[PDB]
RNA sequence: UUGGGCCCGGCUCUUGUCUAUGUUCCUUGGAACAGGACGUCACAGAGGGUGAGAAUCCCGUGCGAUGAGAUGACCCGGGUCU
RNA sequence: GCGAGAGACCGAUAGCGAACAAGUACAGUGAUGGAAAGAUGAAAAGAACUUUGAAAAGAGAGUGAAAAAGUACGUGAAAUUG
RNA sequence: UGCUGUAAAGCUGGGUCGAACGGCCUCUAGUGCAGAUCUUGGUGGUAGUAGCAAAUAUUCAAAUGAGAACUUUGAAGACUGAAGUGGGGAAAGGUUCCAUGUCAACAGCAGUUGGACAUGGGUUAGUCGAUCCUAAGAGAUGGGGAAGCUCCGUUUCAACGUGC
RNA sequence: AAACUUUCAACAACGGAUCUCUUGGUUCUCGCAUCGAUGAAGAACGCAGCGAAAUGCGAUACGUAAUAUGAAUUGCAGAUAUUCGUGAAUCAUCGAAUCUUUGAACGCACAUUGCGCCCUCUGGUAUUCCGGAGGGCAUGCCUGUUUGAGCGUCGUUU
């Protein structure tokens, strides 16, 4: 009875949604995320999992602030406003 | 919702998800200058908030809804 | 070619006894790639013989 | 493993050597960039020469006694004999070696 | 194209909020009409006008704060430079140009000479 | 279940809104490649995994 | 043997703008950007687009010219005040 | 990472897993695993209208250089089939 | 359609097709498939075959509809027989709820029907729950280990009130 | 003799090979040095006149300001929008801003949109209660300020 009969008794989620990554990998009893390591300060990431780094890294999101760093550096981090040409 | 303005003297509004009944009761006082007997709130399955505002007997809900302009 | 081309898989051979060739196969399930061969120069999506 | 009248070889390729293969594709690019750097450095300080004056010294070993090459800097005694202080010498294009 | 920004910048604190309230009730009235039209492109125009007035109010307000804090040693961090975290930790021009008095005496005594050869 | 948290209900709201057919006027745009909504989901076939 | 602060350039970087010559004739073709004839420009016969293999239709290319903005105690070339 | 220029490189079962709403759909409790999928035509000009049919569709007609290009779209091989 | 060559193959006639391609002298290689229980994709025979047989059981008429064994209504005949095939909930699911329209695919026959498809609508709390308490336990702080990720400890060798 | 089986050819199927393409990949070279408590990378949820995704953005939400340029956008619709002009569209440029809930994430806590405390203003006849708006309240460490503790200790007076 370890196959179909035992598979009918699955109604207690071991994992719930994580807050840092929202992946449903938050182990409820351990109070830890199996994906990002929450609530550890550092992100869970390993060099034996290179495909895992591809899935969650810089460039996989919005980069809402890192988009414009190259643009601001190219102008030398200007301060002030643009001058209208007469 | 248009049945409640006539039967129950109740106005139906879409309301911000972050608000509470205290803020909703005040808001209808600046916007329409009407007094709410109570505010009943509801979060819809699509993710928005719906408020059932029953006005005191001093105001007629149908009259106010004509002033707003949706009946 | 890229050094990891054709080798971005975790494929393991099913061994013998399953009536299939002993080429390494993609594990898991739910995708049509599951159960398909990998890592071979004869395989679709594997790495070429003697990569340049 | 060993089958012929052939020399016995020492090919040190039992480590992960393919991860440390440095092919100098940029030899011509490095040559061009080196020339451009040299040109810019020369133009920055014209007409002052780019190279400081170097002494001449004997190459140390029994094998290279005969040869004589360029040293690193003139000794303090040598500059003393020509009336140039080392601190002033370093500012007029002469290299100084306090060790020799 | 809605309200003109250069006209807003000539309006006071009192007038900008009076205009802001009206634009909000303009949007409130239109959202009632959207239930019946149902297509109403005027929605987009009023929203940008609300954004423009909110922008002019904030920019005019931040300029008073900048003038108040002109020349003070400590000013609000949002009014400070936002170059990068690393560039803010860098030594300033005055700090990096500091020299020990021994170092200055030797640099003055032995400057880099200018000379030529073959003469 | 009927008793649910706010985050649970908040995710279900987004799942319903993403499960609509493709609007018709989209296919009329120039150089349009989308012919249908390819991320449809049925409640009985594929589970949300929340 | 000799100090410092600015003002204008140069050098370094980014960026704006500006420029030669066929769409002439005939055939095929839905379309000429094809074939033939006659040419033109070329410091430009790289590349791309345009209803088929387009230097010459268009953008560019080549040649440079001329603005704006930065940046450099730790570059110099002039000034100017100490 | 950012910005460029190239090649006796591959040419959609190849080349990065990904030329496409690709780390997407999907699977797994989870760590993780992970695809398939480019091409009408110069231009939709994407078949008005009549007729049969419950309709889908068919037959005429029409557009187009071509419908031996009808979106189940360039060519259309073989297995297999009428 | 044929021709040439011992052959690997080359050239050609007819049809289809619409945009690039070939000979010769050299260079170069990810360069020749019938097999690898080869890989991926596609298609057969088997074969209109096996089979679609647990849960007692359906029938008549009318209506709708192009079309009714299967939809609706009525008339019967039945069954579950209160430890139910009834009425609610916890876990889990997530719009499956309701109305309107609709039948390309799905409901291993059918379909006018549907938990399908499409468009909308729908969940109202001072008193019901959560929220609060503590249980087994988990786990910060002060500290003490550990190269370190972190481990121990839960008032602990602490000057511990964000007191009233 | 049909039927049937097999083979072939034409046509029609099935299927997507071949051919030719290519805003992709791969490799090599050249140049540059720029994330974050002034809140990053990432996540969630939202935002369009009619949008599901992708792209963009954050309740100022397929975006605001500014500089440049100079007549569009486009599937449809539409100005209380524009044309010898402070003027259409523009991630063209970009120096000002906005930047939800989070996240190193910082009042405590978080399988909860839970529970506080402080300051200013305001509503309810209110220093105490309740409601609202705004601004705050993490840890280690450094310099300083203030308030302290210790017969640790110095001078004095019983
Ligand atoms: Zn996580």
Swiss-Prot record, chain A:
Cofactor(s) essential for the protein: Zn(2+)
Binding site for Zn(2+): 18, 21, 33, 36
Localization: Cytoplasm
Chief location of this protein within or outside the cell: cytoplasm
A GO molecular function held by the record: structural constituent of ribosome
One CC-aspect GO term: cytosolic large ribosomal subunit
InterPro entries: Ribosomal_eL37, Ribosomal_eL37/eL43, Ribosomal_eL37_CS, Ribosomal_zn-bd
GO process annotations (BP): translation
Zinc finger (A20-type): 12-45
Keyword line: Cytoplasm, Metal-binding, Ribonucleoprotein, Ribosomal protein, RNA-binding, rRNA-binding, Zinc, Zinc-finger
UniProt feature coiled coil, ranges: none
Function comment: Component of the ribosome, a large ribonucleoprotein complex responsible for the synthesis of proteins in the cell. The small ribosomal subunit (SSU) binds messenger RNAs (mRNAs) and translates the encoded message by selecting cognate aminoacyl-transfer RNA (tRNA) molecules. The large subunit (LSU) contains the ribosomal catalytic site termed the peptidyl transferase center (PTC), which catalyzes the formation of peptide bonds, thereby polymerizing the amino acids delivered by tRNAs into a polypeptide chain.
HAMAP family: Ribosomal_eL37
Self-association state and partner proteins as the record states: Component of the large ribosomal subunit. Mature ribosomes consist of a small (40S) and a large (60S) subunit. The 40S subunit contains about 32 different proteins and 1 molecule of RNA (18S). The 60S subunit contains 45 different proteins and 3 molecules of RNA (25S, 5.8S and 5S).
Annotated family: Belongs to the eukaryotic ribosomal protein eL37 family.
Protein name: Large ribosomal subunit protein eL37
Gene: RPL37B
Curated annotation (Swiss-Prot), chain C:
Localization (cell): Cytoplasm
Membrane spanning stretches: none
Function as written in the Swiss-Prot or TrEMBL entry: Component of the ribosome, a large ribonucleoprotein complex responsible for the synthesis of proteins in the cell. The small ribosomal subunit (SSU) binds messenger RNAs (mRNAs) and translates the encoded message by selecting cognate aminoacyl-transfer RNA (tRNA) molecules. The large subunit (LSU) contains the ribosomal catalytic site termed the peptidyl transferase center (PTC), which catalyzes the formation of peptide bonds, thereby polymerizing the amino acids delivered by tRNAs into a polypeptide chain.
Subunit structure: Component of the large ribosomal subunit. Mature ribosomes consist of a small (40S) and a large (60S) subunit. The 40S subunit contains about 32 different proteins and 1 molecule of RNA (18S). The 60S subunit contains 45 different proteins and 3 molecules of RNA (25S, 5.8S and 5S).
Family of this protein: Belongs to the universal ribosomal protein uL4 family.
Protein name: Large ribosomal subunit protein uL4
UniProt source species: Candida albicans (strain SC5314 / ATCC MYA-2876) (Yeast)
Full-protein positions shown: 53 to 104 of 363
Curated annotation (Swiss-Prot), chain D:
Disulfide bond sites: none
Chain segments annotated as transmembrane: none
Cellular compartments annotated: Cytoplasm
Quaternary structure note: Component of the large ribosomal subunit. Mature ribosomes consist of a small (40S) and a large (60S) subunit. The 40S subunit contains about 32 different proteins and 1 molecule of RNA (18S). The 60S subunit contains 45 different proteins and 3 molecules of RNA (25S, 5.8S and 5S).
Family under the similarity heading: Belongs to the eukaryotic ribosomal protein eL13 family.
Known function: Component of the ribosome, a large ribonucleoprotein complex responsible for the synthesis of proteins in the cell. The small ribosomal subunit (SSU) binds messenger RNAs (mRNAs) and translates the encoded message by selecting cognate aminoacyl-transfer RNA (tRNA) molecules. The large subunit (LSU) contains the ribosomal catalytic site termed the peptidyl transferase center (PTC), which catalyzes the formation of peptide bonds, thereby polymerizing the amino acids delivered by tRNAs into a polypeptide chain.
Protein's recorded name: Large ribosomal subunit protein eL13
Source organism of this protein record: Candida albicans (strain SC5314 / ATCC MYA-2876)
UniProtKB/Swiss-Prot annotation, chain F:
Domain of life of the organism encoding this protein: Eukaryota
Localization, UniProt: Cytoplasm
GO terms for MF: structural constituent of ribosome
Record has Ribonucleoprotein as a keyword: yes
Keywords, alphabetical: Cytoplasm, Ribonucleoprotein, Ribosomal protein
Listed InterPro entries: Ribosomal_eL39, Ribosomal_eL39_CS, Ribosomal_eL39_dom_sf
Protein name: Large ribosomal subunit protein eL39
Region described as Disordered: spans on this chain: 1-22
Subunit structure: Component of the large ribosomal subunit. Mature ribosomes consist of a small (40S) and a large (60S) subunit. The 40S subunit contains about 32 different proteins and 1 molecule of RNA (18S). The 60S subunit contains 45 different proteins and 3 molecules of RNA (25S, 5.8S and 5S).
Family to which this protein belongs: Belongs to the eukaryotic ribosomal protein eL39 family.
A Pfam family per the record: Ribosomal_L39
Ribosomal protein listed as a keyword: yes
A GO-annotated cellular component: preribosome
Job description of the protein: Component of the ribosome, a large ribonucleoprotein complex responsible for the synthesis of proteins in the cell. The small ribosomal subunit (SSU) binds messenger RNAs (mRNAs) and translates the encoded message by selecting cognate aminoacyl-transfer RNA (tRNA) molecules. The large subunit (LSU) contains the ribosomal catalytic site termed the peptidyl transferase center (PTC), which catalyzes the formation of peptide bonds, thereby polymerizing the amino acids delivered by tRNAs into a polypeptide chain.
Example of a GO biological process term: translation
PROSITE patterns (UniProt xref): RIBOSOMAL_L39E
UniProt source species: Candida albicans (strain SC5314 / ATCC MYA-2876) (Yeast)
């Amino acid at each position: 009875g370890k196959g179909t009969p035992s598979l009918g008794k699955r109604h207690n989620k071991s994992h719930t949604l994580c807050n840092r990554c929202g992946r449903r990998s938050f182990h409820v009893q351990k109070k830890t995320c199996s994906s990002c390591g929450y609530p550890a300060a550092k992100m869970r990431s390993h060099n034996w999992a290179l495909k895992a780094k591809r899935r969650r890294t810089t460039g996989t999101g919005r980069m809402a602030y890192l988009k414009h760093v190259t643009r601001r550096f190219k102008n030398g981090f200007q301060t002030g406003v643009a001058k209208a040409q007469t | 919702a248009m049945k409640k303005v006539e039967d129950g003297n109740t106005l139906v509004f879409q309301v911000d998800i972050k608000s509470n009944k205290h803020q909703i009761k005040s808001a209808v006082k600046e916007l329409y200058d009407v007094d709410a007997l109570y505010v009943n709130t509801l979060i819809r399955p699509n993710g928005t908030k719906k408020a059932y505002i029953r006005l005191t007997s001093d105001y007629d809900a149908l009259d106010i809804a004509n002033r707003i302009g949706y009946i | 070619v890229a050094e990891n081309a054709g080798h971005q898989t975790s494929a393991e051979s099913w061994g013998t006894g399953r009536a299939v060739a002993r080429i390494p196969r993609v594990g898991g399930g739910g995708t049509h790639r599951s159960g398909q061969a990998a890592f071979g120069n004869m395989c679709r999506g594997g790495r070429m013989f003697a990569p340049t | 493993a060993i089958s012929k009248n052939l020399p016995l070889l020492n090919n040190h390729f039992r480590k992960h050597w393919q991860e440390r293969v440095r092919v100098h594709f940029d030899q011509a690019g490095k040559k061009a960039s080196r020339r451009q750097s040299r040109l810019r450095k020369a133009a920055k300080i014209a007409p002052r020469p780019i190279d400081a004056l170097r002494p001449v010294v004997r190459a140390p070993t029994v094998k290279y006694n005969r040869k004589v090459r360029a040293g690193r800097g003139f000794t303090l005694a040598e500059l003393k004999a020509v009336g140039i202080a080392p601190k002033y010498a370093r500012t007029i294009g002469i290299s100084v070696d306090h060790r020799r | 194209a809605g309200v003109k920004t250069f006209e807003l910048r000539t309006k006071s604190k009192e007038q900008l909020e009076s205009q802001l309230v009206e634009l909000k009730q303009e949007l409130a009235t239109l959202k009632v009409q959207k239930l019946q039209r149902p297509s109403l492109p005027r929605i987009h125009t009023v929203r940008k006008n609300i954004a423009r007035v909110l922008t002019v109010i904030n920019l005019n307000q931040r300029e008073n704060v900048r003038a108040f804090y002109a020349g003070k040693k400590y000013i609000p961090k949002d009014l400070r430079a936002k170059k990068t975290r690393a560039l803010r930790r860098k030594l300033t021009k005055f700090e990096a140009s500091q020299e020990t008095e021994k170092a200055r005496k030797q640099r003055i005594a032995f400057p880099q000479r200018k000379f030529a050869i073959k003469a | 279940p009927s008793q649910k948290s706010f985050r649970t209900k908040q995710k279900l709201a987004k799942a319903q809104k993403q499960n609509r057919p493709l609007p018709q006027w989209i296919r009329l745009r120039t150089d349009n490649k989308i012919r249908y909504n390819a991320k449809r989901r049925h409640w009985r076939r594929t589970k949300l995994g929340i």
